Amino acid sequence: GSSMCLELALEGERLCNAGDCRAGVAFFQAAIQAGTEDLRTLSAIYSQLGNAYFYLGDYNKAMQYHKHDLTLAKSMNDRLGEAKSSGNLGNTLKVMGRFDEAAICCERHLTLARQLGDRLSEGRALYNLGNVYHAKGKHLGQRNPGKFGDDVKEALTRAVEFYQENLKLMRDLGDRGAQGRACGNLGNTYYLLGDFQAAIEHHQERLRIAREFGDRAAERRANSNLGNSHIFLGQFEDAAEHYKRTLALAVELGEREVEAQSCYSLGNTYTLLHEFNTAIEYHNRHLAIAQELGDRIGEARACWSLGNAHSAIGGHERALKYAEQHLQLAXXXXXXXXXXXX
């Protein structure tokens, strides 16, 4: 009964782990129905339901069940458990764009962790608050792209502070991989702030750490962020090197979409470098992938770029064909380039 619940809940857990989360949710619900006297078990079922709904994209449900877990955890005076629930709920609220509320939940996690003297839990809370403010400033910037307001800078600034606090604690604890995560997010946040030199330094440390761990994916990310940072410092040769490294990693990892974007970035960067032939090879690569992937929007960008690249070298007729291709795919801009080449 309580044992019925237990078996149902364990099968629920096992099924989410094996990536059958929709069936898992059904077992958690059967387990609730069967009922139990053990609050620690019930609370764990609420939590697993909240995470399974999160992963399935049902954020309202996830929020509901995390809340049930949270409330039950207060009611059981399980402080470490309450801290987890708060962290989970805060994460859910963050994804829903409910940043004020998310921050409150994540502060609570931080408060409890420090009361308990649980440094790893404190670290996590700091990283999560970093994520809330980073997502908030990113969102504010996107929602009004034509302005770079105090609200954006303020959000990103708090994010920097939390990430730095996290990084320092991660250094004190000697948690190398966690240092790598903090550097990556700090690098991103400074990059949004426009402190491109600070972003560089943090992405570089991120790359070093990734290499220590043989973490190729993190290496790819870091090299990509570096390339972008270099572009934003006017350092075009460094950018080209980092994009090429990105490209080589993306081929090794079989990330075809990322291989495409790296190629497109290299075409642009070589155009700035006035290496039109070399740009054209990179753009040709991007174009072929975009075609293979049925990504028409990329195919238009490629045609647009390739039209320009060809004219630049007097390849005027070829240029015309890409411009016409761009028109089809697309309109205003291609018509002008198609007219200008006649």
């Binding site: 078990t41 990283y127 991103n188």
Partner: peptide, 28 residues
């Protein structure tokens, strides 16, 4: 409009974020 300026402008708000899930699991 110019493809290079357009590309660079798109890059301004780009960045590969850290990907580790921070959800916490309560074991049954």
């Amino acid at each position: 409009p110019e493809p290079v300026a357009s590309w660079m402008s798109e890059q301004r708000w780009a960045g590969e974020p850290e990907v580790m899930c921070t959800l916490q699991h309560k074991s049954i």
